[PDB]
């Protein structure tokens, strides 16, 4: 390979994942938000932010750095986040090593400005000698071994479905949904609010809840219906009637108990209630009429496939539906992949769905970082566009 050592920085919507190229696991997974403490103090890190939010101090405000688009929008504190990466975590000068950073799949418009921002961030602020921009649904697709893939990154900002054909991203069919982990952070906290006696500026308290026990509910108490939940109750009773007739019970009523840690209280929710939060990712009309089923994930599967067919469509359809890549931290819940399997096989029954997913729990949270990690270790610099300082200097001229 090349005699090199690159810097891998992934700025997701909820987690800022950073590490080196000579390692396989990142140096740090800090959140993509910061407490502005009020003089202003931008607390970065995981343990520095959870401890400062457990203080519940006034003037503390958790402010995000990456919006729902997957784009950074607070570039000065993201610089201070990246200074917290290079100095406190990476312990290296940003000018010594090359950089590889992550971009979400877009339709084509907002890249050049954020590239110019990344020009202004790598060169004008860190003096990084060269930085490479990879596309995070593309980098996830190549790191699983595919130049043509159907990537669905279900993150905290929502579901990010991306059709990819032969190394290039089909940009007009890239759709970014809104219902993901932070939306599941909202729904879980809403229903348990009579059970926890609870029911921006107080986002110090809100993000602290979403990082301590709401993250604990989504990792443990949440189960996704592998059919639709109305279809799942229909399927589970018909099989249990076969089991009762062949030999000689409702699986919803299984009381899944949550010990709420700030109160020391059992939060007894049956399995349909655990199915209820994960239903809104695929039926967001179950909370409000303003959300169509197309705004949920299920019909947005077929919409992203059919728009990619007009990149001859039916071969593109069989190209994507046999190259399905499932990734994201919100996709780690039990039944996420089988629901995507069901909601897409009911919308394309002719094609056999072969869906792939990083089954490692940790590696699916950092698959955008692990996607950029494999691109950071390419043994030829002609394999990716390595933006030198000249590549900003040609952008400065008119």
């Amino acid at each position: 390979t090349l005699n090199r050592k690159c810097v891998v920085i992934h700025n997701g919507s909820h987690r800022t994942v950073a590490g080196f190229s000579n390692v396989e696991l990142p140096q740090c997974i800090i959140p993509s938000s910061y407490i502005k403490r009020t003089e202003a103090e931008f607390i970065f890190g995981t343990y520095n932010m959870i401890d400062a939010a457990a203080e519940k101090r006034n003037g503390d405000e958790v402010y995000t750095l990456v919006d729902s688009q997957g784009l950074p929008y607070n570039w000065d504190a993201l610089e201070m986040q990246w200074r917290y990466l290079y100095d406190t975590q990476l312990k290296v000068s940003p000018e010594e090593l090359p950089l590889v950073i992550t971009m979400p799949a877009t339709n084509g418009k907002p890249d050049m400005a954020i590239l110019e921002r990344y020009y202004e961030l790598a060169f004008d602020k860190l003096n990084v000698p060269v930085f490479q921009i990879v596309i995070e649904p593309l980098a996830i697709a190549l790191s699983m071994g595919k130049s043509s893939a159907f990537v669905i990154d279900i993150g905290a900002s929502g579901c990010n479905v991306t059709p990819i054909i032969d190394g290039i991203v089909v940009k007009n069919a890239v759709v970014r949904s809104k219902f993901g982990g932070d939306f599941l952070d909202f729904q879980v906290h809403e229903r348990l609010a009579p059970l926890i006696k609870e029911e921006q500026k107080r986002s110090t308290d809100v993000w602290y809840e979403a990082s301590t026990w709401i993250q604990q509910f989504k990792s443990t108490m949440l189960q996704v219906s592998e059919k639709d939940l109305f279809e799942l109750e229909r399927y589970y009773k018909e099989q249990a009637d076969i089991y009762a007739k062949q030999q000689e019970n409702n699986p919803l009523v299984q009381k899944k108990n949550f010990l709420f840690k700030p109160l020391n209280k059992t939060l007894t929710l049956d399995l349909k209630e655990c199915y209820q939060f994960a239903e809104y990712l695929f039926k967001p009309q179950l909370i409000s009429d303003k959300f169509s089923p197309e705004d949920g994930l299920g019909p947005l599967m077929a919409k992203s496939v059919k728009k990619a067919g007009a990149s001859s469509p039916e071969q593109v359809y069989s190209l994507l539906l046999t190259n399905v890549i499932i990734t994201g931290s919100t996709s780690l819940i039990e039944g996420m992949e089988q629901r995507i399997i069901k909601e897409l096989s009911i919308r394309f029954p002719q094609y056999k769905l072969t869906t792939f997913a990083n089954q490692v729990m940790m590696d699916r949270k950092i698959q955008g970082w692990l996607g950029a990690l494999t691109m950071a270790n390419l043994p030829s610099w002609s394999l990716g566009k390595w933006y030198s300082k000249e590549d900003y200097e040609t952008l400065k001229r008119d």
Binding site: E24, L142, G145, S147, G167, T374, L378, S380, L383
Partner: protein, 69 residues
């Protein structure tokens, strides 16, 4: 001519990045297996240092009768 070179370089860039990642995918599987084995190989030397030092304790306990007389 010029059209043959662009399609072949696109196929070469597609296949090589697929191959080099599959190399690093196998590099991911190879390094974790050595970490599993040499950790348990360290556990084997623990049992090796256990049985050598346990027979030393058992032999001197029987040889206490020689110290006793």
């Amino acid at each position: 001519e010029k059209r043959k070179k662009e399609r072949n370089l696109h196929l070469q860039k597609i296949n090589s990045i697929i191959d080099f990642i599959k190399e690093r995918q196998s590099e991911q599987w190879s390094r974790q297996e050595r970490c599993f084995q040499f950790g348990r190989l360290g556990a084997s030397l623990h049992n090796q240092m256990e049985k050598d030092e346990q027979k030393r304790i058992e032999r001197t306990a029987k040889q206490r009768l020689a110290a006793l007389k």
